[PDB]
Amino acid sequence: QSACTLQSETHPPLTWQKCSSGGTCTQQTGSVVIDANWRWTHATNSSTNCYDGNTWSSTLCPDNETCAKNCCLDGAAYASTYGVTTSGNSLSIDFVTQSAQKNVGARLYLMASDTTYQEFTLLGNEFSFDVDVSQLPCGLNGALYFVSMDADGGVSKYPTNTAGAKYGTGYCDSQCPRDLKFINGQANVEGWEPSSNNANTGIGGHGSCCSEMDIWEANSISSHVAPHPCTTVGQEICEGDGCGGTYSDNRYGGTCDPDGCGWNPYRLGNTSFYGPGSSFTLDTTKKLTVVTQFETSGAINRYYVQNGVTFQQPNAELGSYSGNELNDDYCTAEEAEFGGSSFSDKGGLTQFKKATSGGMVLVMSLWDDYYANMLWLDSTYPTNETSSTPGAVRGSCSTSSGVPAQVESQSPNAKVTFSNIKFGPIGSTGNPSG
Ligand SMILES: *[C@@H]1O[C@H](CO)[C@@H](O)[C@H](O)[C@H]1NC(C)=O
Numbered sequence: 524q525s526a527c528t529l530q531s532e533t534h535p536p537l538t539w540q541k542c543s544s545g546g547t548c549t550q551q552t553g554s555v556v557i558d559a560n561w562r563w564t565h566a567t568n569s570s571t572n573c574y575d576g577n578t579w580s581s582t583l584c585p586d587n588e589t590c591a592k593n594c595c596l597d598g599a600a601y602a603s604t605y606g607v608t609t610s611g612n613s614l615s616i617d618f619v620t621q622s623a624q625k626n627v628g629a630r631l632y633l634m635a636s637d638t639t640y641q642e643f644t645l646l647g648n649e650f651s652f653d654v655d656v657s658q659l660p661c662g663l664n665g666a667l668y669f670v671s672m673d674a675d676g677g678v679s680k681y682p683t684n685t686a687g688a689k690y691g692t693g694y695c696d697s698q699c700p701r702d703l704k705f706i707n708g709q710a711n712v713e714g715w716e717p718s719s720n721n722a723n724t725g726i727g728g729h730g731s732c733c734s735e736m737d738i739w740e741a742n743s744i745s746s747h748v749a750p751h752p753c754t755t756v757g758q759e760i761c762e763g764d765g766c767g768g769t770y771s772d773n774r775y776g777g778t779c780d781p782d783g784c785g786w787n788p789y790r791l792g793n794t795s796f797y798g799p800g801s802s803f804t805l806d807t808t809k810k811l812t813v814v815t816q817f818e819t820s821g822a823i824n825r826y827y828v829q830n831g832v833t834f835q836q837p838n839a840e841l842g843s844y845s846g847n848e849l850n851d852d853y854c855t856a857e858e859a860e861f862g863g864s865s866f867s868d869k870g871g872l873t874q875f876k877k878a879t880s881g882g883m884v885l886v887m888s889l890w891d892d893y894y895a896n897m898l899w900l901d902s903t904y905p906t907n908e909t910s911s912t913p914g915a916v917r918g919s920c921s922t923s924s925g926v927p928a929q930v931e932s933q934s935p936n937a938k939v940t941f942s943n944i945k946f947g948p949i950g951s952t953g954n955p956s957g
Pocket residue numbers: 792793794795796804834835836837838
């Protein structure tokens with residue numbers, strides 16, 4: 524797809540800290556851009572929509588190639604249309620924003636320049652950030668994660684995509700998402716099937732796969748961290764159900780691991796560590812600091828800071844595993860106790876280390892779940908299981924919670940705020956910001 528300018532594109536600025544082993548940190552200046560799927564897609568020479576509701580223009584988009592040639596992505600009014608704002612080192616995303624039409628959440632990427640994404644090499648380093656999840660009820664997910672996307676959004680590999688990172692193109696993750704309207708410089712109209720429960724989305728014949736590090740997926744009730752390996756480290760297109768993931772019949776028939784080696788303290792037994800109020804170790808009604816360290820062994824460590832008090836990820840005992848470090852033993856013990864073989868089939872942490880050794884793009888989003896109502900994160904899942912089933916209970920939310928239309932109607936003012944991002948060698952982000 525090309526880019527149109529009927530609406531200007533001004534990326535909200537966002538600063539972050541780059542720290543060094545020497546003990547100092549220096550301020551960096553970037554910005555955020557919203558993913559192409561949230562944008563208006565119209566004819567290059569008119570205001571005629573190429574996509575509207577959840578169906579494509581049969582005339583402008585008779586096939587994927589013709590569609591990309593006739594269509595363009597336009598600019599975004601970040602605050603008024605998408606409820607996205609920034610102030611210094613802070614980023615806020617509102618859940619439902621009402622303008623000429625209704626918008627739900629957003630998916631944003633941190634940029635290095637107005638035309639390129641910022642790439643981070645996680646291995647050997649740590650990522651720290653502050654988050655306020657107090658306004659996120661059951662069914663919502665304020666997420667901060669990394670994916671192995673190209674810095675240019677795919678332009679160099681696919682010339683038919685001239686919009687690029689400036690317009691949020693090139694997304695990919697461990698779900699091999701098929702809901703993307705444009706993949707590899709081509710539209711995804713071929714094989715497109717409108718969503719039965721979402722008037723604005725659908726699933727196409729193509730998907731976009733790549734490694735994914737979910738540093739943070741949470742709301743005021745539950746939180747989870749999870750590395751997701753793929754047999755192909757970087758962005759790669761997939762065909763239909765061969766894609767695997769939540770958008771296909773068989774989520775395990777692809778090149779990526781859709782489940783990941785997830786670590787949810789509540790799911791592991793510590794139901795007093797994270798929640799609203801003083802009865803929990805971490806009070807989710809207040810801002811908290813989350814630090815994630817990627818040691819060269821490939822294992823992942825985590826600690827939190829709130830009100831000046833530091834807490835390592837809580838210890839967990841699963842099978843023969845005991846500790847608080849997310850390593851091979853934990854992931855293997857998890858599949859043995861909770862079930863599944865997706866993470867290990869895709870190479871586990873060894874394969875994932877190939878992703879963190881390379882560059883990954885920072886993603887920050889706010890979303891509700893039209894496929895599973897976010898039950899996998901904050902409730903009992905599958906809903907027919909009980910606490911007698913190992914790992915079934917992940918949070919205290921009702922198995923009836925998270926219906927998109929309901930949470931959108933009841934909690935439109937929900938929001939998430941990410942701030943004070945700091946990146947650098949392990950042991951360096953706690954030092955004074957520059
Ligand atoms: C939960 O984790 C916190 C922090 O490590 C710890 O202080 C507390 O004793 C743990 N409680 C349970 C039930 O595991």
